[PDB]
Amino acid sequence: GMYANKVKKIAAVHDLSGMGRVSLTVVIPILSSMGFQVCPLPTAVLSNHTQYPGFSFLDLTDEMPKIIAEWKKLEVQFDAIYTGYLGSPRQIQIVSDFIKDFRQPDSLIVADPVLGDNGRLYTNFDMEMVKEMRHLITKADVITPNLTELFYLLDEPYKADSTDEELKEYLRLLSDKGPQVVIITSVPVHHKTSVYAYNRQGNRYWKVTCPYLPAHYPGTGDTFTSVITGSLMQGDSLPMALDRATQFILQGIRATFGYEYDNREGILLEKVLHNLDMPIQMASYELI
Amino acid sequence: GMYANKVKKIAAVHDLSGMGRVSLTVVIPILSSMGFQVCPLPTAVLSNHTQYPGFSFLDLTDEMPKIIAEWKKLEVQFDAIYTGYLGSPRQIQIVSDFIKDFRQPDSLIVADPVLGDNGRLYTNFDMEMVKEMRHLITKADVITPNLTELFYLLDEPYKADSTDEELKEYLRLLSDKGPQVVIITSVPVHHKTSVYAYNRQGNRYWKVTCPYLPAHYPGTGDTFTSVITGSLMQGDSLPMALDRATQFILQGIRATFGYEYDNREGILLEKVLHNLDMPIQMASYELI
Amino acid sequence: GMYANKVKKIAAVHDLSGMGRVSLTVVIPILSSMGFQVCPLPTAVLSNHTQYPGFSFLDLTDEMPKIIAEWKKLEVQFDAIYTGYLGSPRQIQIVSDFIKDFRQPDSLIVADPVLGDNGRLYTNFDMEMVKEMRHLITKADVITPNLTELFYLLDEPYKADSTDEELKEYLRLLSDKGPQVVIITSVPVHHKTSVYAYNRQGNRYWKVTCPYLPAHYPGTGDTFTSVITGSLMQGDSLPMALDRATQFILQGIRATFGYEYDNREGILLEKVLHNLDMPIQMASYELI
Amino acid sequence: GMYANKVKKIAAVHDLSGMGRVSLTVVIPILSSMGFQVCPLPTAVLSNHTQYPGFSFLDLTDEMPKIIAEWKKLEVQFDAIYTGYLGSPRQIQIVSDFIKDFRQPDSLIVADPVLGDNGRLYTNFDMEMVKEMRHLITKADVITPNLTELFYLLDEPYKADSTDEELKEYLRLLSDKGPQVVIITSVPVHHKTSVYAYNRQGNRYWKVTCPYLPAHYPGTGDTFTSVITGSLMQGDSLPMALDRATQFILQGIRATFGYEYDNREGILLEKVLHNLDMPIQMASYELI
Amino acid sequence: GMYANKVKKIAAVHDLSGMGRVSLTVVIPILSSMGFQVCPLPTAVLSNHTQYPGFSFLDLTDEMPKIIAEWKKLEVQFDAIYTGYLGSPRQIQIVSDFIKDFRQPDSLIVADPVLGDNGRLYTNFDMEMVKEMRHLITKADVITPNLTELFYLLDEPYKADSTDEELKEYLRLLSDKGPQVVIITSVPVHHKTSVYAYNRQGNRYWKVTCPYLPAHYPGTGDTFTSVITGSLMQGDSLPMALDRATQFILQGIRATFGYEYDNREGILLEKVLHNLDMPIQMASYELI
Amino acid sequence: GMYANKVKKIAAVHDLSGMGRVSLTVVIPILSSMGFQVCPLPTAVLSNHTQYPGFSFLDLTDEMPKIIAEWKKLEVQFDAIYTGYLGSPRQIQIVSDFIKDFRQPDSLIVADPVLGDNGRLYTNFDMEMVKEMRHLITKADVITPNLTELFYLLDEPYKADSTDEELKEYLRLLSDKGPQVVIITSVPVHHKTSVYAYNRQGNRYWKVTCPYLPAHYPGTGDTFTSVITGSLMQGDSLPMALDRATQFILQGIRATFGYEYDNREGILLEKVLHNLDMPIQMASYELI
Ligand SMILES: [Cl-]
Ligand SMILES: [Cl-]
Ligand SMILES: [Cl-]
Ligand SMILES: [Cl-]
Ligand SMILES: [Cl-]
Ligand SMILES: [Cl-]
Ligand SMILES: [Zn+2]
Ligand SMILES: [Zn+2]
Ligand SMILES: [Zn+2]
Ligand SMILES: [Zn+2]
Ligand SMILES: [Zn+2]
Ligand SMILES: [Zn+2]
Ligand SMILES: [Zn+2]
Ligand SMILES: [Zn+2]
Ligand SMILES: [Zn+2]
Ligand SMILES: [Zn+2]
Ligand SMILES: [Zn+2]
Ligand SMILES: [Zn+2]
Ligand SMILES: [Zn+2]
Ligand SMILES: [Zn+2]
Ligand SMILES: [Zn+2]
């Protein structure tokens, strides 16, 4: 544009949902509170996420390219591009072309390869959607698959108990498809849950382990990856980012779980947003 | 819904714009950083605000009622409803019916009666749009007209120099149309700018005066009224809210004005969001 | 009174002691630092707590009703009423009548049923005092007995090792006498100490376990229950309140134990009061 | 006692009032929040201050010496002694003997010579009470008379407009009666109010001027002098103490004045207590 | 070196003085507290600054090149180079060669052209030292002359009252000798003091005006320019940097001036270092 | 000097190194950020510490007495004296005479008896240097030997596995040579590392255990002992000081270890300096 960004700008390719804490209504306040301008490229408008029984849904596939055409005319420079849940191969094509046209030598490209969970694909989707997400992540610097997504992206049978050595192998194989940094979430431990990561730079493998509370809050993945993104953009090391994001989520769940509560509403993000202002007093990351 | 809100919920009826800091991309991070869940009811999707030469525009008039129908099914309770720029009498009808159906005895209804500036109506609009905004504000507890909007809502010739006594009269006449609290922004002083307010409760009139820097940043009104809203929701007195919001804007402009900068991008909100965490050390409000 | 409380008001029925950190000289600064006005209804004036060899003592039993008669004339509304150590059945009668006359639909009534410790009644007291505290707690929403008090209130032989299942039973039986929330302090573990809680709402049982340092600081119970009270009044979940209060006490003891120190002076509260301003970075509560 | 104080201890000779923010219910939370243990020597127990139409009142004159006798047995060392409103010459005698017996080479003795306001003595009192307060302040290091009290202590006709030069003279004459530091509050300016001070050490005269809001909140003097005391105990210079205390009061009044409010309840202290944690960003003191 | 700096590194060319707060003992703690590693290249070792009657002095001219030769071998990359008081033309030669060898495309070079004050050269120095400082500043991006230094660097008769228009001219002429940013300190106003600045980028002129207290604290210039440097390195606009640095100094002087104090010891920096952690609540910069 | 210190002054006898974070470039910013003026008495000037392959080195042995002679003339009073790495018996003589001449009844004398590591003496040194450090520590209140230094100071064969009981014995024997407080660092545990301490006052033994990351950062000892010093000067108990300093180091290492990094540059101190502003939320000290 006219001048270099005074606040770094992050193109956020997620939906807008009216209720719940998912997608743009978590990405925007988190990354803005971490110092960054979030510029939404919305994929859809929903009354609420699809974990409620009903929802309104308006597909924005056709508007995406029109927004992008305008951003080109404005000559906006993005310091990062963060993609989340994409509805189709066509959206992957748009997003893929968007990254191609707007990337710069210093861009951070973060893709959450939203495909499935608990070993099954999300019901919307099939193996072609897996194939196209696999093509998209070749362009990414950082990806954040869950364990289900890891195996689908690798085209491997889902396995729920892998050794650390096997997980290291998996991380490395997925990193060979493009991404310098691969982060796997929701990896079981042996009460307890785990995040693993590999960085092609230095060939390092990291893990963070933390308590697991028996509650599912939709939007947890988008929250995680928003904190990873903002921590990395702030210049934090990979394992510090794992730690900040896992602790932040844990804090939010602790702030939420003690209430009689409808979990579909999400983590009570607003009660813990400003925790990110405090320095981490106890890290737990491990080099493996 | 199933339980009382643990984080107060605010229905935000504004557009989603990809670039600039306006509408939902300021309302969401501000009110979320102040402790409140923002539940967007988007009016339109834009690549960028209309102060740039071009913009994409997708009217969401037809989706609004579908989202609302779903919110009814979810039985969501809103602690506040905040409306901003509305595109048409039809949107006012939707919003008006929405307030009617979702209001509760403790709801705060805040309407920014976005109609014009510098004495002219925004070019989209005409006197019928003024007539319907006038019908809408009858349902509001707090409105935040600029000086242009004051005069149109009262159906009075624009006057750029009024006495304080005349402004008090104007405030009182507009409050008689419904709103307990009327806040007028961008009121010239005698280098310096002013906000005035009237509260039917106690029949009090307040003003805050602060420096004026020669720069227009689109989104300033939405920023102001987001801070007013969140301050009031936090339990602040009316004049404290005037002070917090005016100082917050002043801080943001000071953080922005010293750079070679394209003003259309907005105030550098992210550099000052956390100022709201600090207590005000110097108030300047006046009882008039 | 004339208007709704802008700062919530808490009637504090405790003694005033000149030295030590007990009763009103801990309740007042804690709850005031948490955002609440403490309105003392003093039960007695003492030079110092009774764990020193001597003390002055002035019984205020006869002044209590006179203060209350004036509060009625002022039409003060209390958002909470917190009772601590009461000297006699007559004080219980006064306090009981006070709660009856001043309670409102939203009042929080917190009673610390101060009766004994280490399995014996405090030496002042007998089984009639136990019977009248049992009548008083029927009116309370939250009680905080120690393990000795639990058993006396239930009219059960003291047992120092109970299973978690037995403690759950005890919690439930005591809750049946009135209190929605029963919190048991100083419950041995298996080096380590424990707090347990039951909430009739949702039928939930919680526990927090933390290190035990070998030192008794008089006023620890009043400190605990002041933090529980203020955390609950702030809108925290029950288990968060258990966590904040147990960590706060642990912090204070850690700040005190490393000095050559006369323990009767209490925890060095002033060195840790502002810890309560920070968000909890590590919770430890457990659902049982 | 057994060891040197790890938290400095301040004997506070003020009443305990159940409602309002005056005397011990402001002194205790303020000085405790500033890092200091407040050890109350209560002069009376009241349902509420005497600016309401009625109040209960229990004179503690006879208990004061009993408390002190116990404090002697405990060998408590006080780092400061702060006296406020005293009911009679007999209380002055007790307090005077208390200071004599408990003072140490480093003690700070602060006396607020509570006698009158708006040029008249408080109605309880007469010239003998003035004579005995004059004897008491000979033992003090810091006194905080209002302008009415200045003139009575000097045995001079009240004058409401004095020059700065005349006020300097007055300060110096009163300092000659004992006190190293004399602080005069509520000194009119020329909308605006003023505090003046003299320090015999360096022979310096200081003033702070700040806005005046038209509202009387009982307890303002006790609040002021509690902040002066704690600031001085923290090692602040005299003029910094004037600044912290005047700004703190101004902040509290600003937090209170915008509400429909019964002023007799006091400044909303709890909304601003933690302002004292922040460093002063703008001083206004003047050397005169 | 082996990797890019994780904490930006600033070569600081100043003396080390044992007592006083000047040179490296202010530069190091300030810039370190602002987020930056200070790598000292000491010019001399002194017991104390030369405003005391005596001082030890050890010239390090001969060691400077040896340190630099080692830094070359380590391949250290400096993000900024900040020079202060230089003792001779020979030191200017060393420093000048150092900047030449270690500058990179993004280096910030800050030179305080320490030459004189109150219209006279420092007594050590003559016009040849002025000529060589003039050669040095051609290599600088930011310089911070006082008004005396401005005139000497321009080779112009000292004038103590100049118009703003004349000062703008002076700023522009000095900027033509090399420096993009010229900051003049200690510019009289009309009780009050002023800082002016010019930025060749955008051709902007700024000023900040603040109170003047009658006290000279040696080290004030080094403190100022350390804050300017760190604020600019943090990405602040020029006028924000003027504001942060002037307010920081004002805060320190306010924290110091109220004590009986030996001014030669400097501003009580440690009492205000952490003020820099707080966001500026009131700016005062002016575009001229 | 003319007046008592308003900021406590600490004479720091360490070298000045241009690169790395060791000696004065860590001591100065740490203790200054903790509230204390650091007055350097430099022992040498180096381009960088001696763990790099080459370094410049300028011995300041001959300047030390000249600086001290000037400090005597200034009549500076030091509240603490902290010695680190000393190059020779001659420097020990200077430092020893300095402590003798400048000590006051309240001085804290802290000596880090820098002699060796991993069981060998630093290669510069021999048993005479051990003998003279042993003479120096007789004058110290607090010493911080590593395990290697413990054994040399006691003139005992190095043992890498000692029982806690044996370590207590060692602590006590070394304390008998003078120091009230002996702190041993880098004591192996049984992944994990340990600090032990003895205080002759109360005859107490303390230990803190924390994670061990496999990386050596030169300057870790100087960082530790700077935090111990400042924590003690702030009035913290011995075990709190052990905790603050060990956690601070752990935080810094965690902030550093996740990067590809040249360890010789030191812990990224600037990323964690302000952690010291936060209160410790989890202590781990143990009384043994
Ligand atoms: Cl630019
Ligand atoms: Cl509920
Ligand atoms: Cl009301
Ligand atoms: Cl002691
Ligand atoms: Cl690198
Ligand atoms: Cl002094
Ligand atoms: Zn394409
Ligand atoms: Zn996911
Ligand atoms: Zn309708
Ligand atoms: Zn507007
Ligand atoms: Zn924040
Ligand atoms: Zn009754
Ligand atoms: Zn108890
Ligand atoms: Zn007597
Ligand atoms: Zn008074
Ligand atoms: Zn606080
Ligand atoms: Zn050369
Ligand atoms: Zn200078
Ligand atoms: Zn800080
Ligand atoms: Zn000698
Ligand atoms: Zn060492």
From TrEMBL, chains A, B, C, D, E, F:
<dbReference type="Pfam" id="PF08543">
    <property type="entry name" value="Phos_pyr_kin"/>
</dbReference>
<keyword id="KW-0547">Nucleotide-binding</keyword>
<keyword id="KW-0862">Zinc</keyword>
<dbReference type="InterPro" id="IPR004625">
    <property type="entry name" value="PyrdxlKinase"/>
</dbReference>
<feature type="binding site">
    <location>
        <position position="277"/>
    </location>
    <ligand>
        <name>Zn(2+) 2</name>
    </ligand>
</feature>
<dbReference type="GO" id="GO:0046872">
    <property type="term" value="F:metal ion binding"/>
</dbReference>
<keyword id="KW-0418">Kinase</keyword>
<dbReference type="InterPro" id="IPR029056">
    <property type="entry name" value="Ribokinase-like"/>
</dbReference>
<dbReference type="GO" id="GO:0005524">
    <property type="term" value="F:ATP binding"/>
</dbReference>
<dbReference type="GO" id="GO:0005829">
    <property type="term" value="C:cytosol"/>
</dbReference>
<feature type="binding site">
    <location>
        <position position="97"/>
    </location>
    <ligand>
        <name>Zn(2+) 1</name>
    </ligand>
</feature>
<dbReference type="GO" id="GO:0009443">
    <property type="term" value="P:pyridoxal 5'-phosphate salvage"/>
</dbReference>
<feature type="binding site">
    <location>
        <position position="274"/>
    </location>
    <ligand>
        <name>Zn(2+) 2</name>
    </ligand>
</feature>
<dbReference type="GO" id="GO:0008478">
    <property type="term" value="F:pyridoxal kinase activity"/>
</dbReference>
<protein>
    <recommendedName>
        <fullName>pyridoxal kinase</fullName>
        <ecNumber>2.7.1.35</ecNumber>
    </recommendedName>
</protein>
<keyword id="KW-0479">Metal-binding</keyword>
<keyword id="KW-0808">Transferase</keyword>
<feature type="domain" description="Pyridoxamine kinase/Phosphomethylpyrimidine kinase">
    <location>
        <begin position="75"/>
        <end position="258"/>
    </location>
</feature>
<dbReference type="InterPro" id="IPR013749">
    <property type="entry name" value="PM/HMP-P_kinase-1"/>
</dbReference>
<keyword id="KW-0067">ATP-binding</keyword>
